[PDB]
Coordinates of C-alpha atoms and ligand atoms in Angstrom, one line a residue:
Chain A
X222 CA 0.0 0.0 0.0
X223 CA 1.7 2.8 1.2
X224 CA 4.9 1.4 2.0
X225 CA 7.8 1.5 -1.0
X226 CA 9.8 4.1 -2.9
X227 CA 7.2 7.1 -4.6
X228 CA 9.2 9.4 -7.0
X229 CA 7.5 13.3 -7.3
X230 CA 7.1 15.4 -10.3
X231 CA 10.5 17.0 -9.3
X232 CA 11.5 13.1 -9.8
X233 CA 12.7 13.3 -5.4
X234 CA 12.4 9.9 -4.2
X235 CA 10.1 9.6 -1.4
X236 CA 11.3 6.1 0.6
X237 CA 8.4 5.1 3.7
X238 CA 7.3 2.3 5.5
X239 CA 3.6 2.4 6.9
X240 CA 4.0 0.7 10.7
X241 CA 1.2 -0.9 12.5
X242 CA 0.6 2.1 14.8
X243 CA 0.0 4.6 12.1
X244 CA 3.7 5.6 11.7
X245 CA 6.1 6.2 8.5
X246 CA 9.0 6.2 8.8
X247 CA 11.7 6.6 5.8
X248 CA 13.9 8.9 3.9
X249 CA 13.5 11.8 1.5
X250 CA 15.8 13.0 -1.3
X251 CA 15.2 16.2 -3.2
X252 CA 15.7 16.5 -7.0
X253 CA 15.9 20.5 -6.1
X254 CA 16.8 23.3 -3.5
X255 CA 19.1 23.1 -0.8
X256 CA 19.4 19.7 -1.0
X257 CA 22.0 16.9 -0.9
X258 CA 21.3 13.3 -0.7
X259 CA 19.0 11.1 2.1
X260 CA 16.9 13.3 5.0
X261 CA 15.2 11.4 7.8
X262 CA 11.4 11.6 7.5
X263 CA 8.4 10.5 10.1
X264 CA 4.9 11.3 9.6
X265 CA 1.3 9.5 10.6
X266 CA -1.5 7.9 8.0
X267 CA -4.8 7.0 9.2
X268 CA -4.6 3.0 9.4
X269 CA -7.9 2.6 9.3
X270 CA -9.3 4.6 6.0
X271 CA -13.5 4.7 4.9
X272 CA -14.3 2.2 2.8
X273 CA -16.5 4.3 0.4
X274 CA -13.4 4.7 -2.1
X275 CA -11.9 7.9 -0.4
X276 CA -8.1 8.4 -0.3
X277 CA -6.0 7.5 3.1
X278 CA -4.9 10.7 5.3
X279 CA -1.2 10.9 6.1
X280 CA 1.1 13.8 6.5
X281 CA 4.9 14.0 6.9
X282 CA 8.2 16.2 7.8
X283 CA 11.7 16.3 6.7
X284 CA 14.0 19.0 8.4
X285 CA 16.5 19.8 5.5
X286 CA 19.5 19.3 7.9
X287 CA 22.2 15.6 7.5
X288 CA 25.4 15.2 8.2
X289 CA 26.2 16.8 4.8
X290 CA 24.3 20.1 4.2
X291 CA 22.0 22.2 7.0
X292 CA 18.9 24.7 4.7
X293 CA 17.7 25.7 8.0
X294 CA 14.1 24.7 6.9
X295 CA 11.0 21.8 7.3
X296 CA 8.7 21.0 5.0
X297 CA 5.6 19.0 5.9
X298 CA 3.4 17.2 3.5
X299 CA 0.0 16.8 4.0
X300 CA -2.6 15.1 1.3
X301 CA -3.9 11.8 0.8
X302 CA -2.9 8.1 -0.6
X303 CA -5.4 6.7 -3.4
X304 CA -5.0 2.9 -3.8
X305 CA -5.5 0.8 -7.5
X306 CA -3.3 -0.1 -10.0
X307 CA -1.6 3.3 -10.4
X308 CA -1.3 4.5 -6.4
X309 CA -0.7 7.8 -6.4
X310 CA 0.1 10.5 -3.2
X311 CA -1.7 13.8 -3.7
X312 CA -0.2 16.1 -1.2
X313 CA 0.1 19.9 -0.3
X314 CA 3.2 21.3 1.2
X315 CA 5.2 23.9 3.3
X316 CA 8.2 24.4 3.6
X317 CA 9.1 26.7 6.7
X318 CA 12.9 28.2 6.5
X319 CA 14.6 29.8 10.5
X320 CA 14.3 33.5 9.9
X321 CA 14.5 36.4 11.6
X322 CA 11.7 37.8 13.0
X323 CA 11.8 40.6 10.2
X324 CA 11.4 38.0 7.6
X325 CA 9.4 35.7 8.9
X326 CA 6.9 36.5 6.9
X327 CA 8.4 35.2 4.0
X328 CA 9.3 32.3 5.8
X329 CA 7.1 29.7 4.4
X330 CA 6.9 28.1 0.6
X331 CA 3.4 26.6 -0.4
X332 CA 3.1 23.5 -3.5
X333 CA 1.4 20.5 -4.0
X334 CA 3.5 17.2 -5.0
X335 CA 1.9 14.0 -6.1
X336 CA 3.6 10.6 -6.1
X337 CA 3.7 7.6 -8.3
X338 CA 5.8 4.3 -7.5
Chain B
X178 CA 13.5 25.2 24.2
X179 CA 11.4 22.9 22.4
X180 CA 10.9 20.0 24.2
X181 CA 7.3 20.5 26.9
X182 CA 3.4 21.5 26.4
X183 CA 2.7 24.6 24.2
X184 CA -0.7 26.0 23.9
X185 CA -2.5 27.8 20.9
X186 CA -4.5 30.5 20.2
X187 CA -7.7 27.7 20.0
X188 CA -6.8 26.4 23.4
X189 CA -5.0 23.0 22.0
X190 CA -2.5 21.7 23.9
X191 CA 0.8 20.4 22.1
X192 CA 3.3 18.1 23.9
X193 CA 6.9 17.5 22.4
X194 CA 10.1 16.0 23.3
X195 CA 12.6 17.4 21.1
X196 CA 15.2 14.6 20.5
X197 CA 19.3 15.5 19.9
X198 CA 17.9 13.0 17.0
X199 CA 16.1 16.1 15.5
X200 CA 13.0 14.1 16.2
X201 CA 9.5 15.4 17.8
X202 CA 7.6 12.8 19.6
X203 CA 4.5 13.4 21.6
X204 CA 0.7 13.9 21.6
X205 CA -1.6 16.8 20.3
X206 CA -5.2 17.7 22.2
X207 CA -7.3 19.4 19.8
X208 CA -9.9 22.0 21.3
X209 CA -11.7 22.1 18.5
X210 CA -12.7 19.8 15.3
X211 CA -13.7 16.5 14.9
X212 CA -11.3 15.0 17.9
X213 CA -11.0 14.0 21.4
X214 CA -7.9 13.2 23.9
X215 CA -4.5 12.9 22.8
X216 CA -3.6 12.0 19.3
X217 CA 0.0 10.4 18.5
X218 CA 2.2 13.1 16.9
X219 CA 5.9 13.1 15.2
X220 CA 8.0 15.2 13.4
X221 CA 11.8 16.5 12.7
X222 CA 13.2 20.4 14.1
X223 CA 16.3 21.6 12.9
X224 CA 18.6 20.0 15.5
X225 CA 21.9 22.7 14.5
X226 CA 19.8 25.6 14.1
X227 CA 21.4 28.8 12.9
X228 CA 22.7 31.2 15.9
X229 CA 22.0 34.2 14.3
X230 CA 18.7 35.2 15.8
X231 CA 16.6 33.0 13.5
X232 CA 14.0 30.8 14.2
X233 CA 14.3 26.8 14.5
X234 CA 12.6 25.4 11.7
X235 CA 10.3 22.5 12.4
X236 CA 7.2 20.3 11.4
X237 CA 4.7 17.5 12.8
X238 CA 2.2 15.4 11.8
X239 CA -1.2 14.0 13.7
X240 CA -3.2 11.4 12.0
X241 CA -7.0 12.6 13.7
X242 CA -7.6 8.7 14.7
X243 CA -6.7 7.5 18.8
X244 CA -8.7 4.7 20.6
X245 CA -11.5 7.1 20.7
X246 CA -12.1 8.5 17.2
X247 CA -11.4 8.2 13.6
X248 CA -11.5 12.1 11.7
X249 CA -10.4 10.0 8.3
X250 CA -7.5 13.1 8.5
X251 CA -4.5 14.7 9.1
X252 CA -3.0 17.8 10.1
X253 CA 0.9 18.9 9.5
X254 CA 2.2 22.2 11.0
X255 CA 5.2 23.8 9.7
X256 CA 7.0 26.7 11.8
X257 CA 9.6 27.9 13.6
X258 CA 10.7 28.1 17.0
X259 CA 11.3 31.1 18.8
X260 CA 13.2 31.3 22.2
X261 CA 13.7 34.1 25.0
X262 CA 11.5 36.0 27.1
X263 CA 8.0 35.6 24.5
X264 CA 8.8 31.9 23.6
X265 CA 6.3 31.2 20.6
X266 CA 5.9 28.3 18.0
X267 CA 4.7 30.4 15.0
X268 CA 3.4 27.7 12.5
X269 CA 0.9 27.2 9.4
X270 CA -0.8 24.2 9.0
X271 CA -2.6 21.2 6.2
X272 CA -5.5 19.3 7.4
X273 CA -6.0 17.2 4.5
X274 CA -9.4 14.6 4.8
X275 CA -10.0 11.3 3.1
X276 CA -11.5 12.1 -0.6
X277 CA -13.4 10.5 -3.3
X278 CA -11.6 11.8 -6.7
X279 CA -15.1 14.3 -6.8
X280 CA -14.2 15.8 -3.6
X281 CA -10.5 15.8 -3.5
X282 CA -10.5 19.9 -4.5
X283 CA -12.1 20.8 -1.0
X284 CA -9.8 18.0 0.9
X285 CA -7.3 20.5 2.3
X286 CA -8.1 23.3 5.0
X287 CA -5.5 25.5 5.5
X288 CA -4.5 27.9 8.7
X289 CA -2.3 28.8 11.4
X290 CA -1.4 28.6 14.7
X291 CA 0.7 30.5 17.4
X292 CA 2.0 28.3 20.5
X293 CA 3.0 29.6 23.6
X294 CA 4.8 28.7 27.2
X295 CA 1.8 30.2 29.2
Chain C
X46 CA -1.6 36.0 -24.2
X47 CA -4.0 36.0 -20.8
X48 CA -7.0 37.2 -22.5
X49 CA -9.6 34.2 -23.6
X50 CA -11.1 31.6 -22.1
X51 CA -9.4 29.5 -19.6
X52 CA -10.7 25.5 -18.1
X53 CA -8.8 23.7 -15.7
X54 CA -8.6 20.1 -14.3
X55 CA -12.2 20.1 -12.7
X56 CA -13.9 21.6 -16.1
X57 CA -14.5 25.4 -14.3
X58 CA -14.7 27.9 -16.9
X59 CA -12.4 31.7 -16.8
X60 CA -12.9 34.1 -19.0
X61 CA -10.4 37.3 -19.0
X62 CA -9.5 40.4 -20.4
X63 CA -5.5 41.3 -19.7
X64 CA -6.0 45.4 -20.0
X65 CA -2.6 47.2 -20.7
X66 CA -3.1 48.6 -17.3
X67 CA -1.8 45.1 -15.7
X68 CA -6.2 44.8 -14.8
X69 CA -8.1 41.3 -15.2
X70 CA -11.5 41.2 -15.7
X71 CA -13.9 38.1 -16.4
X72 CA -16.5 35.9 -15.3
X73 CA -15.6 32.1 -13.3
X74 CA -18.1 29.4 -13.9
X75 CA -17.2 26.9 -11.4
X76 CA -18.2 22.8 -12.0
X77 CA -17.6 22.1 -8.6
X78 CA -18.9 23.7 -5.1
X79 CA -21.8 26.0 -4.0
X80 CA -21.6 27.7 -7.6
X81 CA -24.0 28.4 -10.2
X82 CA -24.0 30.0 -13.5
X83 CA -21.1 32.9 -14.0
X84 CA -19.4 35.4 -11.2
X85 CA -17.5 38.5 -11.7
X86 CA -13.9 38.3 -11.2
X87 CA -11.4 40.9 -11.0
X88 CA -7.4 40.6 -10.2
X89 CA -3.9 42.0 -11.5
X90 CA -1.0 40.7 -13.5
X91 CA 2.4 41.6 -14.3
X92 CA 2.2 44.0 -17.8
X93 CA 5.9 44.6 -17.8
X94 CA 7.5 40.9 -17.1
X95 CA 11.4 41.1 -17.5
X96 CA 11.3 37.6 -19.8
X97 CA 8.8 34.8 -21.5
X98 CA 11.4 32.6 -20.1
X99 CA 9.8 33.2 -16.7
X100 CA 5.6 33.2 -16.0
X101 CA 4.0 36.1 -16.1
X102 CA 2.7 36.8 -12.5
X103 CA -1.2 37.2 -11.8
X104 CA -3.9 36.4 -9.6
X105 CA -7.6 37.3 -9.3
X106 CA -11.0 37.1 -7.0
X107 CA -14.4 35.9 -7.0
X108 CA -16.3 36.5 -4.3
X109 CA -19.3 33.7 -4.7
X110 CA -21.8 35.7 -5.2
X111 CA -24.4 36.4 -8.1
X112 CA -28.1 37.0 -9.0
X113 CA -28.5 33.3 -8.4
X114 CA -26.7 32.1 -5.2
X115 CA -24.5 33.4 -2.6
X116 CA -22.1 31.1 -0.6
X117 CA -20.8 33.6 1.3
X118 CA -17.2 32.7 0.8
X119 CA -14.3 34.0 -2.0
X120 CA -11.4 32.5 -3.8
X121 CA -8.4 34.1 -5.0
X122 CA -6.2 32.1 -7.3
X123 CA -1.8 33.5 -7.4
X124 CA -0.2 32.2 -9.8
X125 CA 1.9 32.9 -13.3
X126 CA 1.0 32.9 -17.4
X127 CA 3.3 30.4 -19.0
X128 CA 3.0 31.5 -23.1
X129 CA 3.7 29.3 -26.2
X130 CA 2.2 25.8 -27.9
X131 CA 1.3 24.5 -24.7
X132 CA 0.1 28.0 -22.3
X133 CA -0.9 27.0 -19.3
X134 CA -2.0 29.3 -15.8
X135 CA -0.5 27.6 -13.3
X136 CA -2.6 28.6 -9.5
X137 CA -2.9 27.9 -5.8
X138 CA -5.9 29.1 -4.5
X139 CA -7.3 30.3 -0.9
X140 CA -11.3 30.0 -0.8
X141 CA -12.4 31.6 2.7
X142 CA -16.2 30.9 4.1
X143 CA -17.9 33.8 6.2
X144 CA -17.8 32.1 9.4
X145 CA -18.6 32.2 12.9
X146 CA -15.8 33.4 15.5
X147 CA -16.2 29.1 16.2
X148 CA -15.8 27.8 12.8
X149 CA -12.9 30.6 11.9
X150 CA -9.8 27.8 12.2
X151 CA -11.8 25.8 9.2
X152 CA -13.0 28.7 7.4
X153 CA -9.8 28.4 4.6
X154 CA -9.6 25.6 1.7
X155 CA -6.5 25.7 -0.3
X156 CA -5.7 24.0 -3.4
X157 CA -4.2 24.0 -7.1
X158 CA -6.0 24.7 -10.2
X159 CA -4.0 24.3 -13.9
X160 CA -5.9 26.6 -16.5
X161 CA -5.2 25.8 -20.4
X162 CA -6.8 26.4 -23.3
X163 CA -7.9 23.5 -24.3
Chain D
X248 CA -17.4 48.9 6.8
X249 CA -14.7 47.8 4.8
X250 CA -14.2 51.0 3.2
X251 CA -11.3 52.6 4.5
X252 CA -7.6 52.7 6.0
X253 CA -6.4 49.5 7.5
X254 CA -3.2 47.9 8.7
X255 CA -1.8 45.3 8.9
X256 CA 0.9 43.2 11.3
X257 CA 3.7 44.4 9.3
X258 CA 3.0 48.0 9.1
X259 CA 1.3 47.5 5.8
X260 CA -1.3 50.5 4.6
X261 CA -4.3 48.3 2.5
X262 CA -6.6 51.7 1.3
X263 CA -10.1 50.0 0.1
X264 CA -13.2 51.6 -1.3
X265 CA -16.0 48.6 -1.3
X266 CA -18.3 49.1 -4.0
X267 CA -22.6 49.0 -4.2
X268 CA -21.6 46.1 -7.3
X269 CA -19.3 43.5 -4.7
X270 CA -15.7 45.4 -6.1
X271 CA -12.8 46.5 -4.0
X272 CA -10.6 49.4 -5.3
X273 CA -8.0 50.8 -3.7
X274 CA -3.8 50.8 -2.6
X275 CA -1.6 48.4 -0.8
X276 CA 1.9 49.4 0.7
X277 CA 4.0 46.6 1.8
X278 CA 6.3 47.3 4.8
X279 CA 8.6 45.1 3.6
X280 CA 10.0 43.0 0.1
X281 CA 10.6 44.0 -2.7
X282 CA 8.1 47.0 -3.1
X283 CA 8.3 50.7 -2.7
X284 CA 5.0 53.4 -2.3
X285 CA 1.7 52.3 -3.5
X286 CA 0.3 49.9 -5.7
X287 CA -2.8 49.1 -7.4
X288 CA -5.3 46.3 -5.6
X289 CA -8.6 45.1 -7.0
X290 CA -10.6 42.8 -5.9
X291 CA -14.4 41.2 -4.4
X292 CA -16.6 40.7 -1.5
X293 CA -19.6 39.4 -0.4
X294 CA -22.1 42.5 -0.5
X295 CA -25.2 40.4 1.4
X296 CA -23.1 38.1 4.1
X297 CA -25.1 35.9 6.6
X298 CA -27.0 37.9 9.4
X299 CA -25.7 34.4 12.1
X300 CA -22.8 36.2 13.2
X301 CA -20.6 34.7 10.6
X302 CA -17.8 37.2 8.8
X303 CA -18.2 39.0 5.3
X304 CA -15.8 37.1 2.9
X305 CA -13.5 38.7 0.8
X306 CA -10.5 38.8 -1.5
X307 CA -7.8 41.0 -3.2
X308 CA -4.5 41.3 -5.8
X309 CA -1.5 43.4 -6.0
X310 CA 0.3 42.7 -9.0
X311 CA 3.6 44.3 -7.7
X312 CA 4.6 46.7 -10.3
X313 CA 4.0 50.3 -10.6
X314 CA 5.9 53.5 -11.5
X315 CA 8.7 53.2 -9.2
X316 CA 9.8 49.6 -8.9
X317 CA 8.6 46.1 -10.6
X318 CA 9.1 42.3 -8.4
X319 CA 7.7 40.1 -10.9
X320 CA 5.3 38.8 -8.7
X321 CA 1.6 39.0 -7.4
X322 CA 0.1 38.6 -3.9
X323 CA -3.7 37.3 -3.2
X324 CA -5.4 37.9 -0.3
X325 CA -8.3 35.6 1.1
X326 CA -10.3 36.5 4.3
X327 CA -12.9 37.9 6.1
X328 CA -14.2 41.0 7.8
X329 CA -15.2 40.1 11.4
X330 CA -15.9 42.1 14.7
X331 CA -14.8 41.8 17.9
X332 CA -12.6 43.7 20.2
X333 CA -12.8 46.0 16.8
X334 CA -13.3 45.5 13.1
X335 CA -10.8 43.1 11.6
X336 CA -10.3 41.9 8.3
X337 CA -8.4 38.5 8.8
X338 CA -6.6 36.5 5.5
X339 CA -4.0 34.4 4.5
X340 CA -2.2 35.5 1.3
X341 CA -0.6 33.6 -1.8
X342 CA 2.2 35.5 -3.2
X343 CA 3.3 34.0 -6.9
X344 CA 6.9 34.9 -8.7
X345 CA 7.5 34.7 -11.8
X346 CA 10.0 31.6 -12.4
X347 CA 10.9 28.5 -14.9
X348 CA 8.0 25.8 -14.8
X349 CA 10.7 23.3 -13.1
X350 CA 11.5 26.1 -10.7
X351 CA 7.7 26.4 -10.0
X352 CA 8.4 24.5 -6.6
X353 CA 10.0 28.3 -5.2
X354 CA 7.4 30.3 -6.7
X355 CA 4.6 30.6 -3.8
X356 CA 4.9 32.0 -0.5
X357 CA 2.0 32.1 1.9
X358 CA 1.2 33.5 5.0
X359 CA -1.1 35.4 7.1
X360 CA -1.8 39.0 7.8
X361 CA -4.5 40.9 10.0
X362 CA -5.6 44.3 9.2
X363 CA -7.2 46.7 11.9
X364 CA -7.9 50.2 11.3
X365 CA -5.1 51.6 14.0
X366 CA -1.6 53.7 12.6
X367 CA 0.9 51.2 13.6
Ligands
LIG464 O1 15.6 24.3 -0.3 C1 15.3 24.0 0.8 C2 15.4 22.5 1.2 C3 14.9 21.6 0.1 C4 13.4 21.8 -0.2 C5 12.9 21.0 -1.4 C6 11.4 21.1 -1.6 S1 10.4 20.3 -0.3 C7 8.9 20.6 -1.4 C8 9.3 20.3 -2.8 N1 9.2 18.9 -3.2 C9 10.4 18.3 -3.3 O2 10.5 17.1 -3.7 N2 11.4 19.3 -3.3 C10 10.9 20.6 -3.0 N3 15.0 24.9 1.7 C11 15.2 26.3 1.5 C12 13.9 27.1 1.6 C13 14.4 28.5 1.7 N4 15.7 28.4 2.4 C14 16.0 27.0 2.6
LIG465 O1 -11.6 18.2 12.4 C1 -10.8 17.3 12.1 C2 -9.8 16.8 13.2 C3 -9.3 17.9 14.1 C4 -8.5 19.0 13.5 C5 -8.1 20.2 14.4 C6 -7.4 21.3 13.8 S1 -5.7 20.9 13.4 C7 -5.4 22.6 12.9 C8 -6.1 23.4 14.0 N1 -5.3 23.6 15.2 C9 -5.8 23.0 16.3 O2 -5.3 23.1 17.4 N2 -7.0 22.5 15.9 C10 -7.3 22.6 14.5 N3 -10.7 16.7 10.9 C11 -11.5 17.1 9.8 C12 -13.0 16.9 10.1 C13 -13.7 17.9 9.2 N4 -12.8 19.1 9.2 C14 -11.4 18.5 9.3
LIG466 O1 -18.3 26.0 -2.8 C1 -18.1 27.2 -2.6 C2 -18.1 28.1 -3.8 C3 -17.4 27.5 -5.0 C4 -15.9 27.3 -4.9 C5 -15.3 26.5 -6.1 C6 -13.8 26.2 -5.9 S1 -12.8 27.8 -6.2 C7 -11.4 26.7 -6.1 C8 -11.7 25.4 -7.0 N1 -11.5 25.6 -8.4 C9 -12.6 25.7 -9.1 O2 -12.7 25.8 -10.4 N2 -13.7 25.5 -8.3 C10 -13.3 25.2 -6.9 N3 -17.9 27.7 -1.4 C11 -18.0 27.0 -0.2 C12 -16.9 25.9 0.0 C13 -16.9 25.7 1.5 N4 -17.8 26.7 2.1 C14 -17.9 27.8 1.1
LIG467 O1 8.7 41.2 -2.3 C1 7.9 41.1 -3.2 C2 6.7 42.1 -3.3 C3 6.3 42.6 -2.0 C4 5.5 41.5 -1.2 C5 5.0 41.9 0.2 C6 4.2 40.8 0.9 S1 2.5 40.6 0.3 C7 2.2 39.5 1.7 C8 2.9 40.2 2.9 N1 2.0 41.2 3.5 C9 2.5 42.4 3.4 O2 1.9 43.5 3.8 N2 3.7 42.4 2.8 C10 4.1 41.0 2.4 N3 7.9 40.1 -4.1 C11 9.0 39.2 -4.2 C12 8.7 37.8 -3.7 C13 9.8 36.9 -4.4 N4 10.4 37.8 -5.4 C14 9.5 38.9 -5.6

C-alpha cells in the first residue's frame, strides 16, 4: 500500500514504511533546493481509511538538515494516498525556513506534490 | 526550548520531546474539530539551528484517529521556534481529509497557529 | 496571451481580459462547489514581465456571489501565465467561508488549479 | 465597513473603497520585500453576508509593479471581515513569482496578515 519508494514530479524519491501504529518512517531526497542526498522523514497515516473509495490521510516532515548540508528549513506534507493499480500521493506542502523575525513572513513556501511508485 | 506542552491561540495543547535525533515525539489535544484526547504526533526540528537570531525550523504530523475517534484526516504544522522571554511556535498548517476523486478539490483546510509557554 | 477563455482540471470555466493597465476582468463558472452559472472576477498581472522565459505573475478574486446564489465565501487564485504551444495558468488558490468566531480555524480551503486552453 | 484605511501586522497601509456592485478598489503598501509606495489592488466581496454572526468574505490582488519599482510577482489575499474587540479583516495570502516551470516548486509563498484600522 503505502509502503515503497514514490518518485514526485520533481523526480525526489520519497522512501516510507507504513508501521502498525500509524507511523512512516523513511527517507527523503530532493531532485531540487538546498538539498544533498538522504533526509530522515516521520509522519502518521490513518490506518484505518473509509471504505467508500476515499483516499488514506497521512502527513509527513523532513527537516532539510544531515550530516552533509543544513537549509535551515522543514517541510511538511499533507494530502492523501489513493489505492488501484496506479497508487498515487496527492499532497500539499510547506516548507518553513529559520528566519529572523523581520522576515518571517516570507518564511514559508506553499506547493502540491503527487507521487507515483 | 522545544521540548514541553505549548498551547495555541484555539486552546490545544501540544506536547513534544525534542530529540538530539532532531525528532519530535509526543501527543496533540485538539480544542476544536472532529477530535477528542491525545492524538500520536511526530516530526523532525532543525537539531543545528542557525545562531544568528533566526527561528528553528520545524514540522509535525497528527493522523486525527486515537482509541476514541477516527476524523479520516491529518494535520501537518510547519514553523519555527522562537526562544527568549516571549517563547512562541509560530506555525501554518494542512489538514487534509479522506476524498473521493469528486471531492479531493475541498480536501485541504488551511490555517495557522501561534504556541505559547503560558 | 491572458486574454480568452481559460478550463482547468475540474472543467471550471475563466474568461479574462488582460488590460494594458496590468487589470483582469472576467466571469468564473465553477463545476464544482456552491456555484452556479457565471461570477464576476477581478485581479492583476504583471504588464511589464522582464522575460517569456519566466511566468507572467497574476492572480484574481471571486467572491461567490451572483443573482443566483451566494455562498458567502471567495477565492483568490496567485499564480503565473506560461506563453507558447502548450500556455498553461498555473494557480494555488485560498477560498475563505464567512464564518462564525467558532468555525474561523476551518473557514480556509487551499488547493491548485491548472488553467489551459484546451 | 470595509471601506477605508487598515493595517496590517507588518506596518502595511491596505486603502479599500467597497463598491454598491461587490468590487474592492484601492492601494496596498507593503512594509517590507521588494516593493516601494503604492500599488494598485482590486478585488471582491460578499455584498449580502449571513446575518448568524458569521464574517463577510472577501479577496484582493497586487500585482507588484508600478511606477517606481517592478518584483515580478503578485500577492492574493483571502479572508474575512469580522468584529470583535474592533473591526478586523483576517486573510492568508498567496504570493506568486514569476519563475521556470521546473523552478515552480519556489514560486509561492503564503502567509497570514490581519488588518485593523489603528496607525501602527
Ligand atoms: O531548499 C530547501 C530545502 C529543500 C526543499 C525541497 C522542496 S520540499 C517541497 C518540494 N518537493 C520536493 O521534492 N522538493 C521541494 N530549503 C530552503 C527554503 C528556503 N531556504 C532553505
Ligand atoms: O476536524 C478534524 C480533526 C481535528 C482538526 C483540528 C485542527 S488541526 C489545525 C487546528 N489547530 C488546532 O489546534 N486544531 C485545529 N478533521 C476534519 C473533520 C472535518 N474538518 C477537518
Ligand atoms: O463552494 C463554494 C463556492 C465555489 C468554490 C469553487 C472552488 S474555487 C477553487 C476550486 N477551483 C474551481 O474551479 N472550483 C473550486 N464555497 C463553499 C466551499 C466551503 N464553504 C464555502
Ligand atoms: O517582495 C515582493 C513584493 C512585496 C511582497 C510583500 C508581501 S505581500 C504579503 C505580505 N503582506 C504584506 O503586507 N507584505 C508582504 N515580491 C518578491 C517575492 C519573491 N520575489 C519577488
Amino acid at each position: 500500500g503505502i509502503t515503497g519508494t514514490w518518485y514526485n514530479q520533481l523526480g525526489s524519491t520519497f522512501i516510507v514504511t507504513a508501521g502498525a501504529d500509524g507511523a512512516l518512517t523513511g527517507t527523503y531526497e530532493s531532485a531540487v533546493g538546498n538539498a544533498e542526498s538522504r533526509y530522515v522523514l516521520t509522519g502518521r497515516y490513518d490506518s484505518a481509511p473509509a471504505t467508500d473509495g476515499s483516499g488514506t490521510a497521512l502527513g509527513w516532515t523532513v527537516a532539510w538538515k544531515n550530516n552533509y548540508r543544513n537549509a535551515h528549513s522543514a517541510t511538511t506534507w499533507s494530502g492523501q494516498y489513493v489505492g488501484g493499480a496506479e497508487a498515487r500521493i496527492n499532497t500539499q506542502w510547506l516548507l518553513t525556513s529559520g528566519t529572523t523575525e523581520a522576515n518571517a513572513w516570507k518564511s514559508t513556501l506553499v506547493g502540491h506534490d503527487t507521487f507515483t511508485k
